[PDB]
Design a protein around this nucleic acid. Structure first.
Ligand SMILES: [Cl-]
Ligand SMILES: [Cl-]
Ligand SMILES: [Mg+2]
Ligand code: NA
Ligand code: NA
Ligand code: NA
Ligand code: NA
Length: 326
DNA sequence: CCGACGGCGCATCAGC
DNA sequence: GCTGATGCGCC
DNA sequence: GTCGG
């Protein structure tokens, strides 16, 4: 990657603002700048060159000049040395432990993997499973395994009810050669924006995937969103595959295109696209796109018959999934 | 300057 | 119990 | 931290 050094720096700064400073807008600012620099097709020669990009301002330009001059950032060098900042950053790598919980644990003298392991009773359920699979969850998933996972999910879903449609979204749908997890959008004709003609639609699917030992653990579960753990089966004599995070989202069927736009991401692409929507006078969520009235109040859902329709509303040329990895 | 910055599901908790 | 705030997660 | 009015 042309500007990998700079983008890593900015990502590290973002993480610090989120995890330690608890400054979500600074976090988003750094990530937006990292993303715009990541897609910039030249090797950046100066902060001023970078500043020409949307999302890079005066402060980041200065840091980019320092980084180009020396290969590092004193601000980060110092952060890397702060024990409290270090501990907090580490703890937040456990799924279910955020900035608040991490600072709280550190207060109690819980700040290593070893500490966490002996204090399981101090963890909620989500955290306990995040700890259980700490190592596994930091591994990426080769697209080849994603394909095997897709096959299992789609086929098990079909076995429950042939009218279910399951679509793998996330980085997979954007064509990534590896993914951090598996994202599954689910629809069923019994669940629309107008009616829920069937209960347990998500449950039945989760239950079936548990029955075949694909889903192994649950982080959280409700009527429309499942957040859990899954695992590919391994052959005789061979090492097991790592455990993987899986997210399943049941979306009203008539709202599939807004749903699939959302779940395809990336996260930054979504933020960017939704902010542009706001500027164009619309608001987009995973269900609908709606006009903003004069007062600045969301109007009624606009008709959408394709992903492209959404892009049209906000006056963007269509972008294929593979070009949304921001 | 300075308000806005994407939008929302599930878990947990305070207050009634 | 409920509702509203907040934490944490997803893209 | 950056943007736009
Ligand atoms: Cl902030
Ligand atoms: Cl809506
Ligand atoms: Mg994903
Ligand atoms: Na800029
Ligand atoms: Na975490
Ligand atoms: Na996910
Ligand atoms: Na803005």
């Amino acid at each position: 990657t042309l500007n990998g050094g700079i983008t890593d720096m900015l990502t590290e700064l973002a993480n610090f603002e989120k995890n330690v400073s608890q400054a979500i807008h600074k976090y988003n600012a750094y990530r937006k700048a990292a993303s715009v620099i990541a897609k910039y097709p030249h090797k950046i020669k100066s902060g001023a060159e970078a500043k020409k990009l949307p999302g890079v301002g005066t402060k980041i330009a200065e840091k980019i000049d320092e980084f180009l001059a020396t290969g590092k950032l004193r601000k980060l060098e110092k952060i890397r040395q702060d024990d409290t900042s270090s501990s907090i950053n580490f703890l937040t790598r456990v799924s279910g432990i955020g900035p608040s919980a991490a600072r709280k644990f550190v207060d109690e003298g819980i700040k290593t993997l070893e500490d966490l392991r002996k204090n399981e009773d101090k963890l909620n359920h989500h955290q306990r499973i995040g700890l259980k699979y700490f190592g596994d969850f930091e591994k990426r998933i080769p697209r080849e395994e994603m394909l095997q996972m897709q096959d299992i999910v789609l086929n098990e879903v079909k076995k429950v009810d042939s009218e279910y449609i399951a679509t793998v979204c996330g980085s997979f749908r954007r064509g990534a050669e590896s993914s951090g997890d598996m994202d599954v959008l689910l629809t069923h004709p019994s669940f629309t924006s107008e009616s829920t003609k069937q209960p347990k639609l998500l449950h039945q699917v989760v239950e079936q995937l548990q029955k075949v030992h694909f889903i192994t653990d649950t982080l959280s579960k409700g009527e429309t969103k499942f957040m859990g753990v899954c695992q590919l089966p391994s052959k005789n004599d061979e090492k097991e595959y790592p455990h993987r995070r899986i997210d399943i989202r049941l979306i009203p069927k008539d709202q599939y295109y807004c749903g699939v736009l959302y779940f395809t991401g990336s996260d930054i692409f979504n933020k960017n696209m939704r902010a542009h929507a706001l500027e164009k006078g619309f608001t987009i969520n995973e269900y609908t796109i709606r006009p903003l009235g004069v007062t600045g109040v969301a109007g009624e859902p606009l008709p959408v018959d394709s992903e492209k329709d959404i892009f049209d509303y906000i006056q963007w040329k269509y972008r294929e999934p593979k070009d949304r990895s921001e």
